[PDB]
C-alpha cells in the first residue's frame, strides 16, 4: 500500500548528526518507524542495491538515496521496528530481534 518512492510518503533519516545520514525512519501505518534498513527484502547482511529511496533523499535534497552498509549500533530492540514482506510494502511490520540488520546505516547518496 504505503511504499518509500510513493510522493505523499514521507520518510528520511533518523534525527541523528546528518540529514544525509543515519537509520531510516517512515511513516507509515501508525509511526515514523524505525527500521533496520535492510527490513521487508532482507536479501542481504550488506545490501548492494542503494536505491529506490531516490524520491526519499532527492525530497531531502541530498541527492541520490542513502546507500546501505552496517552503521553498528543505532536502533533500539524494543523503540525501532523490523518489517517484513516484499520491498516496497510498508504495510506490516514487527519489532527488532533477530535479522540480518545489526543497525544497517543508510546514507543519502554518500
Request: charged share 20%.
Amino acid at each position: 500500500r504505503l511504499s518509500w518512492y510513493d510522493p505523499d510518503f514521507q520518510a528520511r533519516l533518523t534525527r541523528s548528526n546528518s540529514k544525509c545520514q543515519g537509520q531510516l525512519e517512515v511513516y507509515l501505518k501508525d509511526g515514523w518507524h524505525m527500521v533496520c534498513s535492510q527490513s521487508w527484502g532482507r536479501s542481504s547482511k550488506q545490501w548492494e542495491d542503494p536505491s529506490q529511496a531516490s524520491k526519499v533523499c532527492q525530497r531531502l535534497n541530498c541527492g541520490d538515496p542513502l546507500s546501505l552498509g552496517p552503521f553498528l549500533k543505532t536502533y533500539t530492540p524494543q523503540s525501532s521496528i523490523i518489517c517484513y514482506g516484499q520491498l516496497g510494502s510498508f504495510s506490516n511490520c514487527s519489532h527488532s530481534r533477530n535479522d540480518m540488520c545489526h543497525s544497517l546505516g543508510l546514507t543519502c547518496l554518500e
